Design a binder for these strands. Structure first.
Lengths: 203, 260, 178
RNA sequence: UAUCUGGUUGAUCCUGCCAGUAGUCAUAUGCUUGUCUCAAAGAUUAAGCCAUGCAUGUCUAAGUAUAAGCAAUUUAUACAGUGAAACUGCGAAUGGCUCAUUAAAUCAGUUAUCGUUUAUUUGAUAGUAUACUUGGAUAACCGUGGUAAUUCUAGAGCUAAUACAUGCUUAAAAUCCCGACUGUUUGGAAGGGAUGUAUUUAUUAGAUAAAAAUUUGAUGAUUCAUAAUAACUUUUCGAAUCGCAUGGCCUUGUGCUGGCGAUGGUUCAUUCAAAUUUCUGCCCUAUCAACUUUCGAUGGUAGGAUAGUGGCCUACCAUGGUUUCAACGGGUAACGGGGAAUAAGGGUUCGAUUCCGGAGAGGGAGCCUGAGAAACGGCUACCACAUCCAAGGAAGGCAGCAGGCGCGCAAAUUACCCAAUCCCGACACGGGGAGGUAGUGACAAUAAAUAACGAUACAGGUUGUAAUUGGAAUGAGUACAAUGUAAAUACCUUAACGAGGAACAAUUGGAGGGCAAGUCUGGUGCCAGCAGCCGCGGUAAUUCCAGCUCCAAAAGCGUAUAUUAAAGUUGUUGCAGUUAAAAAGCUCGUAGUUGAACCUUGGGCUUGGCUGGCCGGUCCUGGACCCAGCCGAGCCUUUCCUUCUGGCCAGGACUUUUACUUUGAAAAAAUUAGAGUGUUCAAAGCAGGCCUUUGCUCGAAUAUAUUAGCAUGGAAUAAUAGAAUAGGACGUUAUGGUUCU
RNA sequence: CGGCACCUUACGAGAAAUCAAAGUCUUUGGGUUCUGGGGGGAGUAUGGUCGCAAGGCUGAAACUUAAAGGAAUUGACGGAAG
RNA sequence: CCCGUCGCUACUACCGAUUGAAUGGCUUAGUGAGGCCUCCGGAUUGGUUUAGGGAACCGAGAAGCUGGUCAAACUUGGUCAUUUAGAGGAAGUAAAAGUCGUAACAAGGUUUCCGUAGGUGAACCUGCGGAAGGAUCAU
């Protein structure tokens, strides 16, 4: 089948190489998984040495992380909004490494209010104000505010991520390789890495 | 090509086994084990070609099936078990304790040792690295893994194995003046003391050694095994010659004087 | 399969085929030694030429060279052992001073003649191939058996040979028993 | 052995070829053949085609046994011994064969995996927050069968596991997060979740220039080892397994505890491997000069795929990459190498083939299982052949062993056996056309018979014989027998038989020259024929056809072909070029080849080493002084020879590049040279030798390899670099100032 | 100084004629380019390439042959001189 | 001594109409077996299993199906290489010296030879420019 040997290629000089031997098993290749978003469907693959690769054909959720304040949460993935290599990967929403996606911000937003006590998005609509008030008015012990008091001040995060929470969806980049590991993990965009990705998405 | 070879032609065998050309087509292929195939000795070779206890390859197999042969205090049932350097072979039926150490001529000399001396061994430290859960360990020349060594132990050093509990009794630090037995090259089998270790970063370091007769040779660090902390105090009973390499003329004169 | 068993020739035919100067000389040398053919001369010629060739290399070396020494004396000791080199001629120069006649003088066929056990040199070869002469306690029937100096004195008739205290041969038994 | 000889002319000296000569681990063939050791053998032309049979299966006390198998009653009514059939496990990816393809490919030597997979072996590694032990199939077995055909199998009835799928069993705390109540100046805390190891993320440890106003491993080098934090998982595994003894504690309950092991199992290391990969090196051809680049060629970024790096593949973007130092193309009667032949040396030709690496199983292609295969004595499909057929269908792959056809100039018995070597298996027990032994074998090589000595007898110079007269010796062969062997044949030993023409009969070519050996006789009569070349034969042929004689080699000798020496007729060593072949019509000129001289010499002193003696000091041999000699040094000479710390080694900081040469390490074994060693010698082989050994004991070397790469001493020879608009070198502690750690 | 040359000699070279280079070459090494490998076939065929063409440059093989040729000696011969 | 046309015989190679023929490799395009991945699908076969008759919904899941991928094989075409046929043409060599002449070798009876261009049965002749390997080293 697909082979990665350099024999069928021509040399650096441009010379065609005469047929040396038949194709070899220890240098084969395989068919791309072409992971989509959908009901989770994973096929395990027998590889060299008896080891196993996990082909993810469809996935819905992945382990996404805040590197800035050290929380990793499993959350749904909506779809790909940008892929650096080929842009039709976005069109058909195919998940590979280094793809930029949108994920629901709620499992992250849940931890923010429990950990810091404030609310993200900062939207000035009526429903958001109701959400904002209920969090800061929640029942706690006496020392719980003092514990939350120490964490106050560092809870103010950069504007671009905070603005995202109003839509309930966060930008992310897939860190894993879905066709190799069987997972679709990632981390949340931040800093100049995020702002560089926003420049073209808004175009 | 489709897998590892399981055969060994007679001419393809290591030269130091002294296997005769016209005995047959094939030679004993050492199994996987503590020592590399080219630098080791199948037990079938030792009990038939050196000790001459077995007259052929069939008789040795019955020997080991009666549990007499012990390598480093443990029974082996594989005729082609790769015994190697400083390995202890005990045949208690004969009341004989062996240690495989090179003669000066580069080959495995038949060296009989005392019963007590058969209860330890020396191993060259290959690497010191931290294992799982923060447990550093040491790999010796025969692949032994000793956990929790002395934190002073580093690479190129020689440790003493109790050969029973698998622990460390003592070790010899690698330094200038250390007694050394060479285990490779054409300087193989020579015994001497380090003079100067020349470091070649990114390559192979060489160990300068002076022999017992003020003979100087230079060899790669990969062949250097420490056997004693200073000159003339080896931790093991050195075989005939004490790693002293002579001229061919001296050997002839000694031969002329010895038998006539 | 099995490792090859090496073999090598022991003689070499001369380049020029018909030269009466060489043709008569080879007849002369073999005729008085009772040699069977010229191969026994081509064998002595080839075997002696390589002895010179070994010595020729060492003389090109600088003296006290341990290869020139160890190899030089080792070659010389072998030659004096069989008597082709005189005991006072241990200089590696007399080895070049050797001739075919020297080692043919060392043959079993030659020496049994000079020890008088057979009337003629051709009768000397006959005593050999007909299994009558024993060197030491081992019967040798090789005409070309080179005799060492220590083996020089131990050449005599075989004890089971009819000429050496053994029983009578086929002819005598048939006739004396007729 | 570092060799030449015949042939142009009336004769000569050349140039030059033809011919002569020798070998071939080189093939065929002609003639012939007595012995011993050893021993190649359908490669060449067809990797052309195959009848027949064999070539891979395997069980221990330690996986599963109700065979309606066997055997005896046994420590046994759960089984117990042996043990077919099957399930399970492992192997079948080795071995053996062939050399078609293949020309930076294979291969060689030498590098890296800080860029990777790895059954097996060997060590290490796991208390993790229904259990007195779980389920349901299923083979073999039983019995209804169908097809002509096969190692085709269809219903039915059971039953089992280290097979298949599940599943608890255990320390102690400790830490972290959430956290009601509470203390109320920030603590205490009831109550919940997380703790081992596997996968995948992300984030933190992963430190080390010496005094003033607490740890931290490895590397030349890392995002390395390891650890932790937040989590994630069609949640890996932290044993529902098998044999022998059966012990100890009594709280005498089938109570609690436990010795040696089988097998299995996570990760690490190791090992047998694998896969890439660094550098330098391959025959002929320019009547092959430009090649590669749509549609991967050169690179970049990102991704996919892979075990992993990498255009290996995809998307996007640049226009790169190779080449007269021979790219690319073509031929190859091309698998590469270790090696072989020939050789004074330098070289030339060969290398299918006993070892190593590679490729292939008719030509392609694609996959299953498996650690390991793009496997062919595994499958699937096509193409080409091809076997049976009941015409529906079914089965193929000898470039494995022997053997059959074709092709050729060209190549063995359808023998025996696991005894020796080793491999595979559950393994002291089975299997092995692997391997060994025998059959054919003038492939080669070693040793080596067909005679010897007398007496007469003439010739003859004390004896060399030439004829007719003998008594011995012996193996060629023939055979008891013993040895030899897995069993035989053979060798060797050996009773008896075995030689006068000792018919137990030696041949192959020749006899003009080269080139050794006739001007002998008869036959033919330019004819037959010979003749490698020159020529011989036209009626006395030194040369044809016959006999006799003689020569060379001898169990061996000619012919043909190819190739090496000869050949200094391929010339680097080492040819020739006025006239014999051959100086471009002549200048310019590029790559290339080659390039004037010149830079610390001399002096002086001290000292180490080995040659000759003198010493003699003699059992050839050993000492200061003495003479020189030949080297190595160590200082001073205006002085190169890196520089500091710990204190000639070890820890740092610096360096024009080389080329060259010493030495070291390497360059597998075999082959070659060569040490030792009486295989009866020898070819060989690495054995062996010892007063005859309830064991002692030399060995089983050492050289050559040679280009590439590594280290090392040196500084002539040949290059290379510096200080000219000074952007130069020192201030070691020069002054400041700028910053950084 | 540079030339174009000439005369004698042969240290030396050469097969010789001859040679001041054709020497310093078996006592074989200053640098470098080109060319030849018995005579014909044959500078032919073919391919390529340059040219308007004529032709130039590059350039075989089959086959055939024991000689072809160089310098000089003697003789013979000359429709050569003395 | 010797050269060349022509004639005979034999052999070797070349050119040559035949858009010649064959073989083999590479390859454009077309069609395209088979596997593998993938997408559904869903013969049957157990229950995560639950139900007053049984409805479910959970798992394994064969054939088949969609799209891909590697791609055998054939057809067409192109190309390269190696063989091979051919009327006729034009050479070469051999044979014996058949026919015509005498070109060369002597000052070869016109000195020869080179390059080039014409011509001629053939050797060859002639022009133009060279050379001496000339028949002159010399006025």
């Amino acid at each position: 089948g697909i082979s990665r040997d350099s024999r069928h290629k021509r040399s650096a000089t441009g010379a065609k190489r005469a047929q040396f031997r038949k194709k070899r098993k220890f240098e084969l290749g395989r068919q791309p998984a072409n992971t989509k978003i959908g009901p989770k469907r994973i096929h395990s693959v027998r590889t060299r040495g008896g080891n196993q690769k996990f082909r993810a054909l469809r996935v819905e959720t992945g382990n996404f992380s805040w590197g800035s304040e050290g929380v990793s949460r499993k959350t749904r993935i909506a779809g790909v909004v940008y892929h650096p290599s080929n842009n039709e990967l976005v069109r058909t929403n195919t998940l590979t490494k280094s793809a930029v996606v949108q994920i629901d911000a709620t499992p992250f937003r849940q931890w923010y209010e429990n950990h810091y006590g404030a609310t993200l998005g900062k939207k000035k609509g009526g429903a958001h104000a109701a959400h904002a008030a209920e969090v800061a008015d929640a029942k706690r012990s006496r020392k719980v505010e003092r514990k939350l008091a120490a964490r106050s001040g560092a809870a103010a995060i950069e504007s671009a991520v905070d603005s995202q929470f109003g839509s309930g969806r966060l930008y992310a980049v897939i860190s894993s390789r879905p066709g190799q590991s069987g997972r679709c993990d990632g981390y949340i965009l931040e800093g100049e890495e995020l702002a560089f990705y926003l420049r073209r998405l808004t175009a | 090509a489709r897998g590892p070879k399981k055969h060994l032609k007679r001419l393809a065998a290591p030269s130091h086994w002294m296997l005769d050309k016209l005995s047959g087509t094939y030679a004993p292929r050492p199994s996987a084990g503590p020592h590399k195939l080219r630098e080791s000795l199948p037990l079938v070779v030792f009990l038939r070609n050196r000790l001459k206890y077995a007259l052929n390859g069939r008789e040795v197999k019955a020997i080991m099936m009666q549990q007499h042969v012990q390598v480093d205090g443990k029974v082996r049932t594989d005729t082609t078990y790769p015994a190697g350097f400083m390995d202890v072979i005990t045949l208690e039926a004969t009341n004989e304790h062996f240690r495989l150490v090179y003669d000066v001529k580069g080959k495995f000399a038949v060296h009989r040792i005392s019963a007590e001396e058969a209860a330890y061994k020396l191993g060259k430290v290959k690497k010191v690295q931290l294992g799982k859960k923060g447990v550093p360990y040491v790999v010796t020349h025969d692949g032994r893994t000793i956990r929790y060594p002395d934190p002073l132990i580093r690479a190129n050093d020689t440790v003493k194995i109790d050969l029973a509990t698998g622990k460390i009794d003592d070790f010899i630090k690698f330094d200038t003046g250390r007694l050394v037995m060479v285990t490779g090259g054409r300087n193989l089998g020579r015994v001497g003391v380090i003079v100067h270790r020349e470091k070649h970063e990114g390559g192979f370091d060489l160990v300068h050694i002076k022999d017992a007769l003020e003979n100087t040779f230079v060899t790669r660090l990969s062949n250097v095994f420490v056997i004693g902390t200073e000159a003339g105090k080896p931790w093991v009973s050195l075989p005939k010659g004490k790693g002293i390499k002579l001229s061919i003329s001296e050997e002839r004169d000694r031969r002329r004087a010895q038998q006539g | 399969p099995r490792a090859p068993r090496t073999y090598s020739k022991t003689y070499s035919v001369p380049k020029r085929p018909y030269e009466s100067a060489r043709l008569d000389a080879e007849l002369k040398l073999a005729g008085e030694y009772g040699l069977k053919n010229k191969r026994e001369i081509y064998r002595i010629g080839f075997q002696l030429s390589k002895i010179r060739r070994a010595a020729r290399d060492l003389l090109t070396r600088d003296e006290k060279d341990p290869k020139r020494l160890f190899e030089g004396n080792a070659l010389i000791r072998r030659l004096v052992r069989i008597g082709v080199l005189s005991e006072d001629k241990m200089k590696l120069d007399y080895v070049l001073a050797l001739k075919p006649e020297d080692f043919l003088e060392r043959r079993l066929q030659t020496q049994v003649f000079k020890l008088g056990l057979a009337r003629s040199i051709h009768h000397a070869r006959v005593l050999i191939t007909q299994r009558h002469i024993a060197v030491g306690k081992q019967i040798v029937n090789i005409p070309s058996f080179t005799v060492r100096l220590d083996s020089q004195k131990h050449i005599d008739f075989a004890h089971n040979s009819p000429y050496g205290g053994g029983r009578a041969g086929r002819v005598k038994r048939k006739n004396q028993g007729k």
